[PDB]
Design an enzyme around this catalytic site. Structure first.
Site: not given
Ligand SMILES: *[C@H](O)[C@H](C[C@@H]1CCNC1=O)NC(=O)[C@@H]1[C@H]2CCC[C@H]2CN1C(=O)COc1ccc(Cl)c(Cl)c1
Ligand SMILES: *[C@H](O)[C@H](C[C@@H]1CCNC1=O)NC(=O)[C@@H]1[C@H]2CCC[C@H]2CN1C(=O)COc1ccc(Cl)c(Cl)c1
Lengths: 306, 306
Positions: B41, B143, B145
């Site tokens: 992603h 960030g 991921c």
């Molecule tokens: C990648 O860095 C990020 C890690 C997330 C961010 C907050 N906590 C985490 O572990 N992944 C994401 O933002 C992913 C993204 C890739 C696949 C789907 C899409 C949405 N998502 C999520 O993690 C969605 O949930 C989410 C909850 C809280 C917050 Cl602050 C955010 Cl940015 C996303």
């Protein structure tokens, strides 16, 4: 989101860990530049361990008595000296993996990462707090002496702890890296004991803020309290007094959550007087006191180290 | 003695962590030999994140679109390919710090260490279990991921987890290193949710053995129970069924403590039916289920890693 007892990445310390053997004793040493630091009780053997005189014992030693092993390379000892309860073994080779470092002494209530080692090899890493009674609730077996505790501050390792011993309650005692014990302990087998501990109040409040940041809100209330009235409750429950400086240090967390520090104190009061009633906070059924305000800010904002 | 949630030393993994930037997305990559692994992603941007078609999105990419940063050295991408939900970026330089490694997929109930990273820089290390519902209760911010989970088996890093996302309950989902998600999750913004979890019964028993090894004995009893009768209690309290294989795996801990596995089950039963009544076990007021039998043996006997 999420909140975990998080240790610092251990790589910088792992490259400093060596094996020190003298006589029948094997423990860990910390190799920085051309000095290996280790607990001075390595120069002891069984009968030496009751009432030793380490100055006497050290003058009887030879450089060649100290077997220093850095992985599969033996380090030649070329000098030795005692600094309080640590031994400084001068070796002919500066550790090429020496990070930028400092020797710092921490305050009770502050936290650090322990790299548990056996035979100079890292076994695991975990986070600890210096208890108010100058012990740490570690995980240490025979041979773990000389494992160090540390913080990392950008690219600099602040070593704060070297492990020396376990006390009869299963808690651990040791020194700063200048060889000075934390608390009223000695590196002898005596009947010494920890002595009564208290709960680190400012840390509990920090962790309540971590909980609010992470969506645990059930313990919040409209109530407030004065600092004096909170501390009368803290005393009864064997919590450290909260100072105005603690309140100041909790400012940023108060600002991020919008919960006044004294309001969070009122919540803590209720938790102390009423318990949790089957609920948990951040996956704990206890009030947790081994996260500092800094630890919370660090984890809930993502500080890294280069 | 002592018992701590202990992570593996992180140094071997720290040397593999890089920054991957594509478009407006920055995340972490894992650099082993001449390949950088990262979540696919990264090739998405905001509007791409609802219902993406990653094959379409990837064919539109160029090697030069992928900014790979290993500390202060940029790595030239010379090839890319998708493997399930991970991207494999072939770079012109093999990582000289590549440890011996394996890509392994773990079972729910098993534990691993997470090296949380931001911008390719390690932030902290902690221990996690794969929950029965294939989530992990991590600590992850935007960030993070591409941070990996791993075990270390002597000198070999078994990578088992790469982080992709957070679910609405604040738990985390990701893939093995072949890009296959743990559990029924997709790397899209959908309304997906974790789904009901259970407590890892064999791990709770392991931790009770850790407690006995460490001098917590108050929960022991003369009672025993059959495996079938224990599992009828486990079901009611939303605990995983205990298998004869779990009993076999708990053998060594049973032998060291002299407490038959089924006897420890009887203790667990009483703890489930009665609670703890103000007591703690290994500093916890909850039954802890993120230590495997191996984790307990490892910590209570001092296994290291070279
Ligand atoms: C990648 O860095 C990020 C890690 C997330 C961010 C907050 N906590 C985490 O572990 N992944 C994401 O933002 C992913 C993204 C890739 C696949 C789907 C899409 C949405 N998502 C999520 O993690 C969605 O949930 C989410 C909850 C809280 C917050 Cl602050 C955010 Cl940015 C996303
Ligand atoms: C050094 O490797 C060792 C670390 C101890 C061993 C068990 N847990 C630990 O943290 N230190 C010691 O063995 C020290 C030794 C140096 C100074 C005094 C003398 C005695 N001592 C102790 O730690 C005494 O307590 C103790 C409790 C349980 C066990 Cl198994 C042992 Cl060996 C010692």
């Amino acid at each position: 989101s999420g909140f975990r007892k998080m240790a610092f990445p251990s790589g910088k310390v792992e490259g400093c860990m060596v094996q020190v053997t003298c006589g029948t004793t094997t423990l860990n040493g910390l190799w920085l530049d051309d000095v290996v630091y280790c607990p001075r009780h390595v120069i002891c053997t069984s009968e030496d361990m009751l009432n030793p005189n380490y100055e006497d014992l050290l003058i009887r030693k030879s450089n060649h008595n100290f077997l220093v092993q850095a992985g599969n390379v033996q380090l030649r000892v070329i000098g030795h000296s005692m600094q309080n309860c640590v031994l400084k073994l001068k070796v002919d080779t500066a550790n090429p993996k020496t990070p930028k470092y400092k020797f710092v002494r921490i305050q009770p209530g502050q936290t650090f990462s322990v790299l548990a080692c056996y035979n100079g090899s890292p076994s695991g890493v975990y986070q600890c707090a210096m208890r108010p009674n100058f012990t740490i609730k570690g995980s240490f077996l025979n041979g773990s002496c000389g494992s160090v505790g540390f913080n990392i501050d950008y690219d600099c390792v602040s070593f704060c702890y070297m492990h020396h011993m376990e006390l009869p309650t299963g808690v651990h005692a040791g020194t700063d890296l200048e060889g000075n014990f934390y608390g009223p302990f000695v590196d002898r087998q005596t009947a010494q004991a920890a002595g009564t501990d208290t709960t680190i109040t400012v840390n509990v409040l920090a962790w309540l803020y971590a909980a609010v940041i992470n969506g645990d809100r059930w313990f919040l209330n409209r109530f407030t309290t004065t600092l004096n009235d909170f501390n009368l409750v803290a005393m009864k429950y064997n919590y450290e007094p909260l100072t105005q400086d603690h309140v100041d240090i909790l400012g940023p967390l108060s600002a991020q959550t919008g919960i006044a520090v004294l309001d969070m104190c009122a919540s803590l009061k209720e938790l102390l007087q009423n318990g949790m009633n089957g609920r948990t906070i951040l996956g704990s059924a206890l009030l947790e006191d081994e996260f500092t305000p800094f630890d919370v800010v660090r984890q809930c904002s993502g500080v890294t180290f280069q």
